[PDB]
Amino acid sequence: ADQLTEEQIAEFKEAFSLFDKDGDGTITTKELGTVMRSLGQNPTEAELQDMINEVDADGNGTIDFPEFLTMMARKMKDTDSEEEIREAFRVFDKDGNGYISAAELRHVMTNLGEKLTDEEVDEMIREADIDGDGQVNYEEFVQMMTAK
């Protein structure tokens, strides 16, 4: 009645803590635009001001807690399967050869606003590797979406 799985309620406020470095519930517009750069893309500093500007209802200069999902709200019209999966898979796997590279999240996660080396990611990759191989195949990270 109150809780089904603690991950969908507690770990969500764990995900918000990933971007919001201040802990007050606000991140810089430089980070959000970096979402493309995880795909090994281009940072939308100027365009995310076009989204921070509209979502800063409580005008944080940055972005607040409730108006965060509203930017995702416009494009959240009917989600796709493997297209939305690849929007996290090839976005995650810097190589994509049946295994995910170790030094990838230090590359990507750093781009996601948490500057760290493979060491910190190693615990992050170890979670995907039950055999402790230091890399992530399709089957282990797959498991992570059936249980986000």
Partner: peptide, 16 residues
Amino acid sequence: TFKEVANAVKISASLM
């Protein structure tokens, strides 16, 4: 994190 981070990297499917 490989397990929880999925919801974090997946939030880039709206603008990208």
